[PDB]
Structure formats: structure tokens, C-alpha cells
Amino acid sequence: MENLNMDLLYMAAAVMMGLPAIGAAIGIGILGGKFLEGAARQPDLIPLLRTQFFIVMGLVDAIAMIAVGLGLYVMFAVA
């Protein structure tokens, strides 16, 4: 209700803050690498537009979830 809802919002937001180290790091490294394999075959390819979409959508999982979730983690526990 009061403290239990603040423990739940905190724990999900810090779990979300670490999630980009799997998600958006596979976005840049593996779906930028697989993008450049697509550009060597055909520079306007359908799996090129999939992999380039996951370059932006990956590294934006990084920016949004790291700043909102590290913000909430430090507000509840450190204060």
C-alpha cells in the first residue's frame, strides 16, 4: 500500500536500469554487426531495416531505462 508499493516500484526500476546491458548492448554489437553483413549483400535490404531499427530501439532502451531506473534506485535506498 504505502511502503510495499514503493519497494515494488524501486525493485522493477533498478531491474529495468540493468536490463539494457543484455538488450541494448546486443542491439549495437550484434544488430549493428548483422546490419553491416546486410549492407555488404544489399544496401536497401529488409533484414538491413530490421537490424538498423534495433540499433536505435536498443540504444534507446539504454538511455530511457538507465536514467529513470538509476534515478528511482538512488531516491528510495540512498535518499
DSSP output for 34-63: HHHHHHHH-TT-HHHHHHHHHHHHHHHHHH
59, burial (CB in 10 Å: exposed 0-12, middle 13-18, buried 19+)? middle
Options 13, 14, 61, 73, the catalytic residue: 61
For 56-59, which contacts have Cβ atoms below 8 Å and span 24 or more sequence positions?
A: 57/27, 58/20, 58/23, 58/24, 58/25, 58/26, 58/27, 58/28, 58/31, 59/24, 59/27, 59/28
Cβ contacts of residue 24 below 8 Å, gap of 6+? 58, 59, 60, 61, 62
Out of 3.20.20.70, 3.30.1490.190, 1.20.20.10, 1.20.120.80, select the CATH number for domain 1-79: 1.20.20.10
Would you kindly state where each structural domain of the chain is located, as residue ranges?
1-79
Active-site annotation holds for 44: no
Burial class (CB in 10 A: 0-12, 13-18, 19+), 33: exposed
Which technique?
NMR
